Amino acid sequence: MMGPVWRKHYITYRINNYTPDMNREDVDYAIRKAFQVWSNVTPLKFSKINTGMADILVVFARGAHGDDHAFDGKGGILAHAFGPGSGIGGDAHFDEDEFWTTHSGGTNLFLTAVHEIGHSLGLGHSSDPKAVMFPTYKYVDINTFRLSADDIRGIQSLYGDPKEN
Ligand SMILES: [Ca+2]
Ligand SMILES: [Ca+2]
Ligand SMILES: [Ca+2]
Ligand SMILES: [Zn+2]
Ligand SMILES: [Zn+2]
């Protein structure tokens, strides 16, 4: 059986704080485009809010940061996220000890967020090294990036595919 799902289509996110590694606008853009990857294949729609309680909180932090999953310094775990639910449910956390970038150096924020949001929507890891839900990081350019068949099958068995027209 698989884990619980969001039981609505309009889902909100809030960026709690920004990493200083990147331009603030680029954080915004990378996160929006990572949600779009998943919006493109489901009926889910994501919007950013700046106040109010959001479904998905995006956090940058080092070490312990208030949940049961203290980060571990540079390398190791890069980020983690919680599956659908209230409260900490759906939240996505990125380790500030990594160096977050818009490019092939350090750790690419966009690619990392697509994986984390995969978790936030209910997915687990894939055994396919081409899947974005493969557990370890491997850079691919934002332009060439595509969800694998396995990523699509996974997300569509949870939410359906849309819906158009
Ligand atoms: Ca780490
Ligand atoms: Ca939440
Ligand atoms: Ca950093
Ligand atoms: Zn955390
Ligand atoms: Zn993961």
Fold of 1-165: Collagenase (Catalytic Domain) (3.40.390)
Edge to edge, the sheet with strand 56-61 lists: 45-48, 10-15, 56-61, 92-95, 79-81
For the chain, the distance separating the N- and C-terminal CA atoms, rounded to the nearest angstrom, is: 31
- CA 30 to ligand 3 center in whole angstroms: 16
CA pair distance 164, 141, nearest whole angstrom: 29
Ligand nearest to the CA of 68: 4
Ligand nearest to the CA of 70: 4
Experimental approach: X-ray
CA pair distance 50, 75, nearest whole angstrom: 30
Q: Check the annotation: does 115 bind a ligand.
A: yes
Total residue count of the chain as it appears in this document: 165
Answer yes or no: 116 catalytic: yes
Contact 130, 104 (CB under 8 A): no
Task: For the chain, give the longest Cα–Cα distance.
Answer: 47
- Burial class from Cβ neighbours inside 10 Å (0-12, 13-18, 19+) for residue 8 reads exposed
- Catalytic site residue from 38, 78, 90, 116: 116
- CA 50 to ligand 5 center in whole angstroms: 26
Residue 13 in 3-state DSSP? strand
Resolution reading in Å: 1.9
- Burial class from Cβ neighbours inside 10 Å (0-12, 13-18, 19+) for residue 9 reads middle
